[PDB]
Scaffold this motif. Structure first.
Motif, PDB file in Angstrom:
ATOM      1  N   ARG A   1      41.842  47.214  46.031  1.00 53.30           N
ATOM      2  CA  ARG A   1      43.064  46.910  45.308  1.00 53.30           C
ATOM      3  C   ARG A   1      42.985  45.627  44.503  1.00 53.30           C
ATOM      4  NH1 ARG A   1      47.884  49.754  47.388  1.00 53.30           N
ATOM      5  NH2 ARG A   1      47.227  51.031  49.182  1.00 53.30           N
ATOM      6  N   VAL A   2      42.118  44.691  44.900  1.00 53.35           N
ATOM      7  CA  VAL A   2      41.891  43.482  44.112  1.00 53.35           C
ATOM      8  C   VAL A   2      41.306  43.840  42.757  1.00 53.35           C
ATOM      9  CG1 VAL A   2      40.578  41.347  44.019  1.00 53.35           C
ATOM     10  CG2 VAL A   2      41.684  42.016  46.114  1.00 53.35           C
TER      11      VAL A   2
ATOM     12  N   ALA B   1      45.414  45.161  51.151  1.00 56.59           N
ATOM     13  CA  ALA B   1      45.757  44.661  49.829  1.00 56.59           C
ATOM     14  C   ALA B   1      44.725  43.687  49.289  1.00 56.59           C
ATOM     15  CB  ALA B   1      47.125  43.984  49.852  1.00 56.59           C
ATOM     16  N   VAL B   2      43.788  43.243  50.121  1.00 57.13           N
ATOM     17  CA  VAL B   2      42.721  42.355  49.685  1.00 57.13           C
ATOM     18  C   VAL B   2      41.381  42.968  50.062  1.00 57.13           C
ATOM     19  CG1 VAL B   2      44.020  40.221  49.633  1.00 57.13           C
ATOM     20  CG2 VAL B   2      43.139  41.075  51.783  1.00 57.13           C
TER      21      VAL B   2
ATOM     22  N   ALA C   1      46.086  39.822  44.754  1.00 60.56           N
ATOM     23  CA  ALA C   1      45.410  39.372  43.547  1.00 60.56           C
ATOM     24  C   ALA C   1      46.372  38.787  42.523  1.00 60.56           C
ATOM     25  CB  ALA C   1      44.639  40.533  42.925  1.00 60.56           C
ATOM     26  N   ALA C   2      47.663  39.102  42.638  1.00 57.47           N
ATOM     27  CA  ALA C   2      48.639  38.635  41.663  1.00 57.47           C
ATOM     28  C   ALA C   2      48.813  37.126  41.738  1.00 57.47           C
ATOM     29  CB  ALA C   2      49.974  39.341  41.886  1.00 57.47           C
TER      30      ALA C   2
ATOM     31  N   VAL D   1      46.534  34.768  42.707  1.00 56.35           N
ATOM     32  CA  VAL D   1      45.413  34.033  42.134  1.00 56.35           C
ATOM     33  C   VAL D   1      45.319  34.281  40.636  1.00 56.35           C
ATOM     34  CG1 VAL D   1      44.110  33.814  44.252  1.00 56.35           C
ATOM     35  CG2 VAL D   1      43.903  35.879  42.923  1.00 56.35           C
ATOM     36  N   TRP D   2      45.767  35.454  40.172  1.00 52.45           N
ATOM     37  CA  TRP D   2      45.811  35.724  38.738  1.00 52.45           C
ATOM     38  C   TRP D   2      46.808  34.811  38.034  1.00 52.45           C
ATOM     39  CZ3 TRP D   2      43.238  38.199  35.048  1.00 52.45           C
ATOM     40  CH2 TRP D   2      43.900  38.496  33.853  1.00 52.45           C
ATOM     41  N   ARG D   3      48.013  34.679  38.592  1.00 48.43           N
ATOM     42  CA  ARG D   3      49.006  33.799  37.988  1.00 48.43           C
ATOM     43  C   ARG D   3      48.655  32.332  38.176  1.00 48.43           C
ATOM     44  NH1 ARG D   3      54.106  36.368  38.839  1.00 48.43           N
ATOM     45  NH2 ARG D   3      54.192  38.322  37.644  1.00 48.43           N
TER      46      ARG D   3
ATOM     47  N   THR E   1      44.219  45.691  40.952  1.00 48.83           N
ATOM     48  CA  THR E   1      45.247  44.807  40.407  1.00 48.83           C
ATOM     49  C   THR E   1      44.706  43.995  39.238  1.00 48.83           C
ATOM     50  OG1 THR E   1      46.262  44.681  42.595  1.00 48.83           O
ATOM     51  CG2 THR E   1      46.926  43.028  40.998  1.00 48.83           C
ATOM     52  N   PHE E   2      43.443  43.574  39.317  1.00 50.38           N
ATOM     53  CA  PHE E   2      42.864  42.827  38.211  1.00 50.38           C
ATOM     54  C   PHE E   2      42.581  43.719  37.010  1.00 50.38           C
ATOM     55  CE2 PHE E   2      41.306  39.285  41.151  1.00 50.38           C
ATOM     56  CZ  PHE E   2      42.441  38.560  40.876  1.00 50.38           C
TER      57      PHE E   2
ATOM     58  N   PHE F   1      45.975  44.011  35.394  1.00 52.89           N
ATOM     59  CA  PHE F   1      46.272  42.811  34.619  1.00 52.89           C
ATOM     60  C   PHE F   1      45.419  42.727  33.358  1.00 52.89           C
ATOM     61  CE2 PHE F   1      48.365  40.498  38.294  1.00 52.89           C
ATOM     62  CZ  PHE F   1      49.578  40.417  37.647  1.00 52.89           C
TER      63      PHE F   1
ATOM     64  N   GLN G   1      55.367  37.923  42.822  1.00 50.96           N
ATOM     65  CA  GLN G   1      53.978  38.064  42.416  1.00 50.96           C
ATOM     66  C   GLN G   1      53.263  36.731  42.261  1.00 50.96           C
ATOM     67  OE1 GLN G   1      53.741  40.564  38.968  1.00 50.96           O
ATOM     68  NE2 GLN G   1      53.659  42.451  40.177  1.00 50.96           N
TER      69      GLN G   1
END
Lengths: 71, 148, 50, 46, 50, 48
Positions: free
Chosen positions: F30-31, F25-26, A53-54, A56-58, F34-35, F38, A47
């Motif tokens: 899904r961005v 996935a982008v 997105a994982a 850029v989040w990390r 996924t955000f 999180f 990840q």
């Protein structure tokens, strides 16, 4: 009885958002405690390197506290 | 043997809100929740000035009207609350031994005390900056004794 | 003292930006105070003076 | 001057705003004001 | 000629300053075109990619 | 043109998934997902 200029919940979740991630433990004691750490390591690299997105989040989650040299 | 050592903590605090003081009588408080985004504020008054029709022939003020504005004063308050990482790294895990249960609830009380002190620091800073705003737009008494 | 306590507001006035204000904030970057009153005194009853 | 002369839904309040106003504004208490006397005392065109 | 006439429109596609636009017309001097479409973009479900 | 700019290859039968789940996935569906997940982890953080 009255309302403060700051809600404690919003400041609490903001601190929880801006918190640094914990340092990665690696138990060398038991294999059952070792396989979870290596699974966490491979999931962390997955990840953190997969193009989603994982990553850029990390990457934004990371803070850079460097230790100085000693004589 | 490693002995755990407990030290007594106190919170010498007076829980004061900006609505608890009588200073909020002077201020109509709204909570614009995005004031970091505001570049400038503006408020216009349009005072229409009536006059007096006069018997003598004088130069008559034909419907004077002032349009004044008032720019907002925008100033931020910043506290700097510290928090050690030593009682922060134990906040992520779960206790299973009573020594970990002791140090975990000690870390919890530490971050909860230092967290609610930052809120109280911002409240006291809010009352300080409101009082100094009232001081800055305040002429002394011996001027308004005649100018009013 | 002639009194011991005074009544007053328990919470701050809530002024958040509405959808019309946000659109005026996104495009032109200019937010009004009360968009419903501006609509009520221009495009709902302009001849009805205040 | 930053004063906008645009027409507006002017909210009418009842406070005595013009309590010694002209001698205040001629001396310049306000940071930026505009006096409109006579034919300029109207609403501006849109 | 492969055709002798073309199918085109019959009237000018008009657009006048409506109600929601008139507030920004009077207070700002800044009218957008299709304000309702901007409301549909950044208020009514802004999580939708165009 | 012997065909009207159409080719019908059976090569594109297994890369219809392997090349697809990278560009989708982008794809902002899904961005945001996924955000938001999180963000849900962030909200799950201080309540413990």
């Amino acid at each position: 009885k009255v309302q403060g200029s700051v809600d404690r919940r919003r400041l609490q979740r903001r601190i929880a958002g801006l918190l640094p991630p914990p340092a990665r433990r690696l138990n060398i004691s038991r294999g059952s405690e070792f396989t979870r750490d290596v699974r966490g390591l491979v999931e962390e690299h997955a990840q953190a390197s997969s193009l989603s997105a994982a990553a850029v989040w990390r990457a934004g989650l990371l803070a850079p506290w460097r230790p100085p040299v000693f004589g | 043997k490693f002995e755990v050592l407990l030290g007594v903590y106190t919170n010498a605090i007076q829980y004061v809100r900006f609505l608890e003081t009588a200073l909020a009588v002077s201020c109509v408080n709204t909570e614009f929740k995005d004031l970091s985004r505001m570049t400038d504020g503006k408020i216009q008054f349009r005072i229409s000035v009536p006059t007096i029709a006069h018997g003598d022939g004088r130069r008559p003020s034909k419907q004077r009207t002032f349009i004044v504005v008032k720019n907002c004063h925008k100033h931020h308050i910043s506290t700097e609350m510290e928090l050690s990482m030593l009682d922060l790294e134990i906040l992520h895990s779960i206790p299973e031994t009573p020594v970990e249960y002791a140090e975990y609830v000690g870390a919890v009380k530490t971050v909860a005390s230092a967290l609610q002190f930052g809120v109280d620091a911002l409240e006291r800073g809010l009352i300080n900056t409101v009082l100094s705003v009232k001081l800055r737009h305040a002429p002394p008494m011996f001027i308004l004794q005649t100018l009013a | 003292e002639a009194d011991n306590q005074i009544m007053g507001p328990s919470s701050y006035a809530s002024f958040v930006v509405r959808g019309e204000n946000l659109v005026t904030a996104v495009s032109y970057g200019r937010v009004m105070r009360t968009f419903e009153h501006f609509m009520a005194r221009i495009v709902d009853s302009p001849e009805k003076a205040g | 001057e930053g004063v906008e002369n645009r027409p507006f839904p002017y909210l009418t309040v009842d406070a005595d705003l013009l309590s010694n106003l002209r001698q205040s504004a001629a001396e310049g208490l306000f940071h930026s004001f505009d006096l409109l006397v006579g034919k300029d005392a109207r609403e501006a065109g849109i």
